[PDB]
Every structure is written in structure tokens, then in C-alpha cells.
């Protein structure tokens, strides 16, 4: 993984992309890494915000699956035609595979203004792939076609998606693993939450309601409604020397200080304790104010340092987004159904354990089984 270090570009606001070479003759495109989804989908027509798109008509190796796919999000959507093509990864391992690829032909609110990426690489499992779980995800094709070890890691600074390996130059200190609770999203278990060493003291199921996932495709740390409210009440108590407007706590508004006077100082650390591999252990990742107060420097208040609060409310569980992954080298150890975290080599954000609980309760939440998911065979 000499040749693989530093193969990523981007930032939390706009995302992290990897280079991918699709078809013969080759088209090299910038692809958003997304651990919250399972489709390889590329922009495939002109669009105001796209610098490059996939031109199926220049690819001699493209095969139409003669099926469309419709992907709605709360916020927008994308759709296109399913196909397959040859894929290799310029920085990645020296292999070529034939993968599913959705040619995005229409979308709404998916591509963002000068993102520098043209496509999405869904790295979660086939259980959440569209249109259904028989469309094999990219990484599943990679591993089955090539003997690449079944693991990848993300160092989110530039940055590095390391394929099939762990690289020790990328982190310092302990690598701590938390078990994958279920292979669909990269679902994990949060056993405890502290804000400035103070335990939030909720039933630990409330932290994983209805799931907790590790998602490179979302910007914020997202927290279930009740957890969000309790954290904001607490973070608020800790910085009560500054009274912000509501819109700031809603993520709707910047607050500012005279350039270089920010009182980081009054903002607390957030520790999430992740379930350990050993069954009464846990470990914690500690989030700095700098990870959750994101700088945005707009225009006419050029002289101030200004920030967005990057913790937001959720009704679909906890999402450990990019602002959280950034401080860490994260190892998606698929082969062993675990996720590893260590301090990135790119206060300090900390990975710390072990913490032992004598009576450790089950913190996972079982989602009500709909007749729909019960019907389908697997
Ligand atoms: C760390 C990368 C975060 C990114 S990259 C592009 C966007 C985006 C926002 N609106 N449209 C795209 C975002 C923000 C992100 N939203 C989204 N992330 C991806 C691109 C993975 C899927 C998606 C589809 C749609 Cl249709 C709208 C937003 C998003 C979020 O909700 O936090
Ligand atoms: Zn490159
Ligand atoms: Zn059957
Ligand atoms: Zn299935």
C-alpha cells in the first residue's frame, strides 16, 4: 500500500472522492466514497455541476442490463440504467474487475455545485443496494473476482482509501475494533455518551435508536431526537458564557469571533463509547469542538472566524458522519465483521480503552420486522 497512500481528495462539506477508471478505452472519474450506500453510480449525461460524466458510448466494454433504477432520498433522488463495465483503481491494487454500474441519467439535488466528483461508490452491503439485494456491490465484485483481502480503510484529512490492507504509517497508537452488529449499513453499537466527562445518563438503547452507523456520505454527527436534545442542553451548559441564537443550534446559522479569538476553551469534548470485541468491554472515541464546530468563511465578514454547528437531529438513528471520521483512521474489516478506529497521523481526538462494565446490558435496538422485509427470500 505504498502505491495507495494519499489516493483521496476532498473535505467534509463536499465529500471524499477516489479515482476510478471505467471501461476500454478508459474514462478516469472522481468518485464520492460512501459507506452509507451500496450502488456504484456515475453521472452519465451533461449537468451544470459536473466536470466529467461517464460516456457509455465511448466504452466498448459497457453492457446494458436493460433495467432502470430509481433512488429516492429524503432530500432528492437519482435514477438511471443499470449496466456493467470493467473497472480498475489507479492507485489501488493491480487488478481489473467487471462490476455493476448505474449510469445516472437524471437526478435532483444529488450533484452539488463544483464538488469535483461525478459519481458515488457505495461501500455498504448488498442488503441495502437498489433496486434490490441481488445487484452485487462494487467491493463484493472486487473481492470475489480478485483475492484482494476483504477490508478497506479510510484516513479522512487529501486522505487515503486503502484497499485490501491496513497501513501503519497512517495512524499512531491503539487500533480499537467495534463489532459490526449486522451487515447492511456498517451498523455499530454505542454503549455510553459523555459530554465533558459527564455521562448523559440515558438507557443505552436510546443511542442506537433505531440504529448507529458509520457513514462517510453524511457530513454531520446525527443523533436520535432525545439524544440530540440532551447533548445540546449539555453542550449549551458548557458554553453558557456565550448565548447563541437558536438557528446556530439548528445548524442554520454561523456564529463568529474576531479572527483567531475563538474560545474553543468553552466547548466540551464528546466521547462515544463503542461496544468492544470482548463482551463487557468498550472503548471511546473523543470528538473535539474542532470536529463539530465547522468553519465556513463566506464573504463580507472576512475579518471574523465563523462556524457551523455540525451536530444535527435524526429520526433514522445515529450517523457517525464525516466530521467524526476525519479525526480517525477507520478500518472497515469486513472479513471479520468489525470496524477499527485509531488516531489519524494526518487537546487531540483520542481513541481510548478498555472500559469494563460488570453488568453490561444489550444496547442494540431491534427494528420492528415489517411484513415487507419478512416476505422477501434471501
Ligand atoms: C461528507 C459528504 C457529504 C455530502 S456530499 C454531497 C452531499 C449533498 C448534499 N446535498 N446533495 C448532495 C453531502 C451532504 C450529505 N448528503 C448526501 N449524501 C450523499 C451524496 C451520500 C447522498 C445524497 C443524496 C441526495 Cl439526493 C442528497 C444528499 C445526499 C449529508 O446529508 O450530510
Ligand atoms: Zn491520483
Ligand atoms: Zn425462495
Ligand atoms: Zn438478501
Coordinates of C-alpha atoms and ligand atoms in Angstrom, one line a residue:
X1 CA 0.0 0.0 0.0
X2 CA 3.0 2.2 -0.9
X3 CA 1.1 3.0 -4.2
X4 CA -2.3 3.6 -2.3
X5 CA -1.5 6.1 0.4
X6 CA -2.8 9.6 -0.5
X7 CA -5.3 8.4 -3.2
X8 CA -8.2 10.6 -1.9
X9 CA -9.3 14.3 -2.4
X10 CA -11.9 16.5 -0.7
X11 CA -13.4 17.7 2.5
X12 CA -16.4 17.1 5.0
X13 CA -18.6 19.7 3.3
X14 CA -18.4 18.3 -0.3
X15 CA -17.1 14.8 0.4
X16 CA -14.2 12.4 -0.2
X17 CA -13.6 11.0 -3.6
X18 CA -11.4 8.2 -5.1
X19 CA -10.2 7.9 -8.8
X20 CA -11.7 5.1 -10.7
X21 CA -11.0 4.1 -14.3
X22 CA -14.1 2.7 -16.1
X23 CA -14.1 0.8 -19.4
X24 CA -11.9 0.5 -22.5
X25 CA -10.9 2.8 -23.8
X26 CA -10.5 4.2 -20.2
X27 CA -12.6 7.0 -18.5
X28 CA -11.0 8.2 -15.2
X29 CA -13.6 9.8 -13.0
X30 CA -13.7 11.2 -9.4
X31 CA -16.0 9.1 -7.2
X32 CA -17.5 10.0 -3.8
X33 CA -16.7 7.2 -1.2
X34 CA -20.0 6.4 0.6
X35 CA -20.1 3.8 3.4
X36 CA -23.9 4.6 3.8
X37 CA -25.0 3.0 0.5
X38 CA -24.4 0.1 -1.8
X39 CA -24.6 1.2 -5.5
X40 CA -21.8 2.2 -7.8
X41 CA -23.4 5.1 -9.8
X42 CA -21.9 7.6 -12.1
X43 CA -23.2 10.8 -13.7
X44 CA -23.8 9.7 -17.3
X45 CA -25.1 12.9 -19.2
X46 CA -24.4 16.6 -19.1
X47 CA -25.3 18.6 -15.9
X48 CA -24.5 22.1 -14.7
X49 CA -22.4 21.0 -11.7
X50 CA -20.4 18.1 -13.4
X51 CA -16.9 18.5 -14.9
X52 CA -16.8 15.0 -16.3
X53 CA -19.5 12.3 -16.8
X54 CA -19.4 8.7 -17.8
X55 CA -19.9 8.4 -21.6
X56 CA -21.2 4.9 -22.1
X57 CA -20.9 5.3 -25.8
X58 CA -17.1 5.6 -25.7
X59 CA -16.9 2.4 -23.7
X60 CA -16.5 -0.8 -25.9
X61 CA -16.7 -2.9 -22.7
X62 CA -20.1 -1.5 -21.4
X63 CA -23.1 -3.9 -21.3
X64 CA -26.6 -2.6 -20.7
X65 CA -28.6 -4.6 -18.1
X66 CA -31.7 -3.4 -19.8
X67 CA -33.1 -2.3 -16.4
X68 CA -33.6 1.1 -14.7
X69 CA -33.3 2.0 -11.1
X70 CA -34.9 4.8 -9.1
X71 CA -33.1 6.0 -5.9
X72 CA -35.2 8.5 -3.8
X73 CA -33.7 10.2 -0.8
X74 CA -35.5 12.4 1.8
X75 CA -33.6 15.3 0.2
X76 CA -33.5 14.4 -3.5
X77 CA -33.0 11.4 -5.9
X78 CA -31.1 9.9 -8.7
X79 CA -32.0 7.4 -11.4
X80 CA -30.6 5.7 -14.4
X81 CA -30.0 2.5 -16.3
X82 CA -28.2 -0.5 -14.9
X83 CA -25.2 -1.8 -16.7
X84 CA -21.8 -3.5 -16.1
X85 CA -18.3 -2.4 -17.1
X86 CA -14.6 -3.0 -16.4
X87 CA -13.2 -1.1 -13.5
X88 CA -9.7 -0.6 -12.2
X89 CA -8.4 1.8 -9.5
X90 CA -5.4 4.0 -10.5
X91 CA -3.9 4.0 -7.0
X92 CA -5.4 0.7 -5.8
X93 CA -4.4 -2.9 -6.3
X94 CA -3.2 -4.0 -9.8
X95 CA -6.5 -5.6 -10.8
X96 CA -9.5 -5.1 -13.2
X97 CA -13.0 -6.3 -12.4
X98 CA -16.3 -6.3 -14.0
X99 CA -18.7 -4.5 -11.8
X100 CA -22.3 -3.2 -11.8
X101 CA -22.6 0.4 -12.6
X102 CA -25.6 2.6 -12.7
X103 CA -25.5 5.3 -15.4
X104 CA -27.2 8.2 -13.8
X105 CA -29.4 9.9 -16.4
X106 CA -31.5 12.2 -14.2
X107 CA -31.1 13.4 -10.7
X108 CA -32.4 16.0 -8.3
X109 CA -30.4 17.7 -5.6
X110 CA -27.7 14.9 -5.7
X111 CA -24.8 16.6 -7.6
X112 CA -23.5 19.7 -5.8
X113 CA -22.0 22.9 -7.2
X114 CA -18.3 22.3 -8.0
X115 CA -18.0 19.2 -5.9
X116 CA -15.3 17.8 -8.1
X117 CA -17.0 14.3 -8.0
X118 CA -19.0 12.7 -10.8
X119 CA -20.3 9.6 -9.0
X120 CA -20.8 7.7 -5.8
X121 CA -19.1 4.4 -4.7
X122 CA -21.5 2.7 -2.3
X123 CA -19.4 0.5 0.0
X124 CA -22.1 -0.8 2.3
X125 CA -23.5 -4.3 1.9
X126 CA -25.9 -5.8 -0.7
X127 CA -28.8 -5.9 1.7
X128 CA -29.4 -2.1 1.1
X129 CA -28.4 -2.0 -2.7
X130 CA -31.0 -0.8 -5.2
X131 CA -33.3 -1.9 -6.8
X132 CA -32.8 -5.0 -4.6
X133 CA -30.1 -7.0 -2.9
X134 CA -29.3 -9.1 -6.0
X135 CA -27.3 -6.2 -7.6
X136 CA -23.8 -7.1 -6.3
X137 CA -22.0 -4.1 -4.8
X138 CA -18.7 -3.0 -6.2
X139 CA -16.4 -4.2 -3.3
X140 CA -18.2 -7.6 -3.2
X141 CA -17.2 -8.0 -7.0
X142 CA -13.7 -6.8 -6.2
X143 CA -13.1 -9.4 -3.5
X144 CA -14.8 -12.3 -5.4
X145 CA -13.0 -11.6 -8.7
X146 CA -9.6 -11.0 -7.3
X147 CA -8.4 -12.4 -3.9
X148 CA -7.9 -8.7 -2.6
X149 CA -8.2 -9.1 1.2
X150 CA -11.9 -8.3 2.3
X151 CA -11.2 -5.0 4.1
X152 CA -10.6 -1.3 3.3
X153 CA -9.7 1.7 5.4
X154 CA -10.4 5.5 5.2
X155 CA -8.0 8.2 6.5
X156 CA -10.0 11.4 6.0
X157 CA -7.9 14.5 6.2
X158 CA -6.4 14.7 0.8
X159 CA -6.6 11.3 2.6
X160 CA -6.4 7.6 1.7
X161 CA -8.8 4.9 1.0
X162 CA -6.5 1.9 1.4
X163 CA -7.9 -1.2 -0.4
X164 CA -7.3 -4.7 1.0
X165 CA -4.9 -3.6 3.7
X166 CA -4.1 -1.6 6.9
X167 CA -1.3 0.9 6.5
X168 CA 0.6 1.6 9.8
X169 CA 2.0 4.9 8.7
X170 CA -1.5 6.3 8.7
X171 CA -2.2 6.1 12.4
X172 CA -0.5 6.4 15.8
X173 CA -1.2 4.4 19.0
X174 CA -4.1 1.9 19.6
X175 CA -6.3 0.4 16.9
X176 CA -9.6 -0.5 18.6
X177 CA -12.3 -2.6 17.0
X178 CA -16.0 -2.5 17.4
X179 CA -18.1 -5.4 16.1
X180 CA -20.4 -4.9 13.0
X181 CA -23.8 -5.6 14.5
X182 CA -25.3 -6.5 11.1
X183 CA -24.1 -6.4 7.6
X184 CA -26.4 -3.9 5.9
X185 CA -25.2 -0.4 6.8
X186 CA -22.0 -0.5 8.7
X187 CA -24.0 -0.8 11.9
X188 CA -22.3 -0.5 15.3
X189 CA -23.3 -0.2 19.0
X190 CA -22.8 2.9 21.2
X191 CA -22.7 1.9 24.9
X192 CA -22.2 5.3 26.5
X193 CA -22.1 9.1 25.8
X194 CA -20.2 11.7 27.8
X195 CA -20.0 15.4 27.2
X196 CA -17.1 16.9 29.2
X197 CA -16.7 13.7 31.2
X198 CA -20.4 13.9 32.2
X199 CA -22.4 10.9 31.3
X200 CA -25.7 11.8 29.5
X201 CA -27.3 9.0 31.5
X202 CA -29.9 7.7 29.1
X203 CA -30.8 4.0 28.5
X204 CA -28.1 3.0 26.1
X205 CA -30.7 1.7 23.6
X206 CA -31.6 5.4 23.1
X207 CA -28.2 5.9 21.5
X208 CA -28.9 3.2 18.8
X209 CA -32.4 4.1 18.1
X210 CA -33.2 2.7 15.6
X211 CA -29.5 2.0 14.6
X212 CA -26.0 3.5 14.7
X213 CA -23.9 3.5 11.5
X214 CA -20.6 4.7 10.3
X215 CA -21.3 6.9 7.2
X216 CA -18.7 8.7 5.1
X217 CA -21.5 10.1 2.9
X218 CA -23.1 12.3 5.6
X219 CA -21.4 15.4 6.8
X220 CA -22.8 15.7 10.4
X221 CA -22.8 13.7 13.5
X222 CA -26.6 12.9 13.6
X223 CA -28.1 11.8 16.9
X224 CA -31.7 10.5 17.6
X225 CA -34.1 13.3 18.7
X226 CA -33.8 12.6 22.5
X227 CA -30.1 12.1 22.5
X228 CA -29.6 15.3 20.3
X229 CA -31.7 17.4 22.8
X230 CA -29.8 16.1 25.8
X231 CA -26.5 16.8 24.1
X232 CA -27.3 20.2 23.0
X233 CA -28.6 21.0 26.6
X234 CA -25.3 19.8 27.9
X235 CA -23.0 21.4 25.3
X236 CA -25.0 24.7 26.0
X237 CA -24.4 24.5 29.7
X238 CA -20.7 24.2 29.0
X239 CA -20.5 27.3 26.9
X240 CA -23.1 29.4 28.8
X241 CA -20.6 32.4 28.7
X242 CA -21.8 32.8 25.1
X243 CA -25.5 32.9 24.3
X244 CA -26.1 31.8 20.7
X245 CA -29.2 32.1 18.7
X246 CA -31.4 29.0 18.1
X247 CA -30.5 28.9 14.5
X248 CA -27.0 28.2 15.5
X249 CA -28.0 25.0 17.4
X250 CA -30.3 24.1 14.5
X251 CA -27.3 24.2 12.1
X252 CA -29.0 27.0 10.3
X253 CA -26.6 30.0 11.3
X254 CA -22.9 30.8 11.8
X255 CA -21.5 32.4 14.9
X256 CA -18.3 34.4 14.8
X257 CA -15.4 35.7 16.9
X258 CA -12.7 38.3 15.9
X259 CA -10.2 36.3 13.7
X260 CA -8.1 34.0 15.9
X261 CA -10.0 34.7 19.2
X262 CA -12.4 31.6 19.2
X263 CA -12.9 30.3 22.8
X264 CA -12.5 26.6 21.9
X265 CA -12.0 26.6 25.5
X266 CA -15.7 26.9 26.5
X267 CA -16.7 24.0 24.1
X268 CA -16.8 20.5 25.6
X269 CA -15.4 17.2 24.2
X270 CA -17.8 14.4 23.2
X271 CA -16.9 10.8 23.9
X272 CA -18.8 8.0 22.3
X273 CA -18.2 4.6 23.8
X274 CA -18.4 1.8 21.1
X275 CA -19.1 -1.8 22.1
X276 CA -15.7 -3.7 22.4
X277 CA -15.0 -7.2 20.7
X278 CA -14.8 -8.7 24.2
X279 CA -18.4 -8.7 25.5
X280 CA -18.2 -6.5 28.7
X281 CA -15.6 -4.1 27.2
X282 CA -16.0 -0.8 25.4
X283 CA -13.8 1.9 24.1
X284 CA -14.3 5.6 23.4
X285 CA -13.6 7.9 20.6
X286 CA -13.3 11.5 21.8
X287 CA -14.6 14.3 19.5
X288 CA -13.1 17.8 19.7
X289 CA -15.0 21.0 19.4
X290 CA -13.0 21.5 16.2
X291 CA -14.6 18.4 14.6
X292 CA -18.1 19.5 15.5
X293 CA -17.7 23.3 15.0
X294 CA -17.1 23.6 11.3
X295 CA -15.5 26.8 9.9
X296 CA -17.4 28.5 7.0
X297 CA -15.8 31.7 5.7
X298 CA -18.3 33.4 3.4
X299 CA -17.8 37.0 2.1
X300 CA -18.5 40.3 3.9
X301 CA -17.4 39.4 7.5
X302 CA -14.0 38.4 6.1
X303 CA -12.2 39.5 9.3
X304 CA -14.1 37.1 11.7
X305 CA -13.7 33.4 12.1
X306 CA -17.2 31.9 11.7
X307 CA -18.7 28.4 12.4
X308 CA -21.5 26.0 11.8
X309 CA -22.6 23.6 14.5
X310 CA -22.2 20.1 12.8
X311 CA -24.4 18.0 15.1
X312 CA -28.0 17.6 13.8
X313 CA -31.1 15.8 14.8
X314 CA -32.2 12.4 13.3
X315 CA -35.2 10.1 13.1
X316 CA -33.2 7.3 11.5
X317 CA -30.6 6.7 14.3
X318 CA -27.1 7.9 15.0
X319 CA -24.9 8.7 12.0
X320 CA -21.3 9.0 12.5
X321 CA -20.6 11.2 9.6
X322 CA -17.5 12.7 8.0
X323 CA -17.0 15.3 10.7
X324 CA -16.4 12.4 13.2
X325 CA -14.4 10.1 10.8
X326 CA -12.0 12.9 10.0
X327 CA -10.1 12.7 13.3
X328 CA -9.5 8.9 12.8
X329 CA -8.1 6.2 10.7
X330 CA -11.1 3.9 10.2
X331 CA -10.7 0.3 9.3
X332 CA -13.7 -1.4 7.7
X333 CA -12.6 -5.0 8.4
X334 CA -15.3 -6.8 6.5
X335 CA -13.6 -10.2 6.7
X336 CA -14.0 -10.1 10.5
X337 CA -17.2 -8.2 10.8
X338 CA -15.5 -5.3 12.7
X339 CA -14.7 -1.6 12.3
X340 CA -11.4 -0.3 13.7
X341 CA -10.6 3.2 14.9
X342 CA -7.2 4.8 15.7
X343 CA -6.0 8.4 15.9
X344 CA -5.1 9.7 12.5
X345 CA -1.5 10.5 11.7
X346 CA -2.8 13.3 9.3
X347 CA -6.4 18.6 23.1
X348 CA -6.3 15.8 20.5
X349 CA -9.1 13.4 19.2
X350 CA -8.5 10.2 21.1
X351 CA -9.2 6.5 20.9
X352 CA -9.1 5.1 24.4
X353 CA -9.8 1.8 26.2
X354 CA -10.5 -0.6 27.6
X355 CA -13.5 0.4 29.8
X356 CA -15.1 -2.7 31.6
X357 CA -18.7 -2.9 32.6
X358 CA -19.6 -5.6 35.1
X359 CA -23.3 -5.6 34.3
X360 CA -23.2 -4.7 30.5
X361 CA -26.7 -4.5 29.1
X362 CA -27.6 -5.1 25.5
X363 CA -27.6 -1.6 23.9
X364 CA -28.6 -2.6 20.3
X365 CA -32.2 -1.9 19.1
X366 CA -34.2 -4.4 17.2
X367 CA -36.1 -2.8 14.4
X368 CA -39.8 -3.9 14.1
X369 CA -39.9 -6.5 11.3
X370 CA -42.4 -5.3 8.6
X371 CA -44.4 -7.8 6.6
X372 CA -42.4 -6.4 3.6
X373 CA -38.9 -7.5 4.8
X374 CA -40.4 -10.7 6.1
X375 CA -41.9 -11.6 2.8
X376 CA -38.6 -11.5 0.7
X377 CA -36.3 -14.5 0.4
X378 CA -32.5 -14.2 0.8
Ligands
LIG1 C1 -19.2 14.0 3.5 C2 -20.0 14.1 2.2 C3 -21.3 14.8 2.4 C4 -22.1 15.2 1.2 S1 -21.5 15.0 -0.5 C5 -22.9 15.7 -1.3 C6 -23.8 16.0 -0.4 C7 -25.1 16.5 -0.9 C8 -25.9 17.3 -0.1 N1 -27.0 17.5 -0.9 N2 -26.8 16.8 -2.1 C9 -25.6 16.2 -2.1 C10 -23.5 15.8 1.1 C11 -24.3 16.0 2.3 C12 -24.9 14.6 2.7 N3 -26.0 14.2 1.8 C13 -26.0 13.3 0.8 N4 -25.0 12.5 0.7 C14 -24.9 11.6 -0.4 C15 -24.2 12.2 -1.7 C16 -24.0 10.4 0.0 C17 -26.3 11.0 -0.8 C18 -27.2 12.2 -1.0 C19 -28.2 12.1 -2.0 C20 -29.1 13.2 -2.1 CL1 -30.3 13.1 -3.4 C21 -28.9 14.4 -1.4 C22 -27.9 14.4 -0.4 C23 -27.1 13.3 -0.2 C24 -25.4 14.8 4.1 O1 -26.7 14.6 4.2 O2 -24.7 15.1 5.0
LIG2 ZN1 -4.3 10.0 -8.2
LIG3 ZN1 -37.2 -18.6 -2.4
LIG4 ZN1 -30.7 -10.6 0.7

